[PDB]
Amino acid sequence: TLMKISRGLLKTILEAAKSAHPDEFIALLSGSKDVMDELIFLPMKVFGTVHSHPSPSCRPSEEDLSLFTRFGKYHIIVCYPYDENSWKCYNRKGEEVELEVVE
Ligand SMILES: [Zn+2]
C-alpha cells in the first residue's frame, strides 16, 4: 500500500550523514514493493534520493528542487544534528510527504 522506510535504512542514513558532516551526504533510495530498505551509493528501480545539510534545516534548497525531478518520487533531507527527528521527505514537486517507519 503506502510506502514506508525500514528502521535499519533510516539508522544507516543518519549515521552516514553524521560521518559526512560537515560535508553533505548524498545517495539513492530503493527497495522492493512498499518498503524502502536499499541504500545505493554514488560512484534497478530508484525510489528516490537522500542527502544532508550541515545546518538545522530540512528545507529544500534551490538545487534540491532540481534534484527531486530526476531520481524517483521520494526525496529525503536529513539535517544537523541528524537525530531521528532531523529528516523530512518530499516528492518531485517539493511538497512535504509523510513517510512512516516500519514497526
Ligand atoms: Zn539540499
Numbering used by the authors: -1 to 41, 60 to 119
The study reports:
AfJAMM consists of an eight-stranded β sheet (β1–β8), flanked by a long α helix (α1) between the first and second strand, and a short α helix (α2) between the fourth and fifth strand. The zinc-binding site is adjacent to a loop that spans the end of β4 to the beginning of α2 and is stabilized by a disulfide bond between C74 from this loop to C95 on β5. AfJAMM behaves as a monomer during size exclusion chromatography, suggesting that the dimer observed in the asymmetric unit is an artifact of crystallization. The latter hydrogen-bonds to the sidechain of E22 on β2. Nonetheless, the active site metal and ligand atoms of thermolysin and ScNP can be superimposed on those of AfJAMM with an RMS deviation of approximately 0.4–0.5 Å. Meanwhile, the γ-hydroxyl group of the highly conserved S77 in AfJAMM occupies a position similar to Nɛ2 of H231 in thermolysin.
In this study, we present the crystal structure of the Archaeoglobus fulgidus AF2198 gene product AfJAMM and explore the implications of its novel metalloprotease architecture. Unlike many JAMM proteins that contain an additional domain, the AfJAMM protein consists entirely of the JAMM domain.
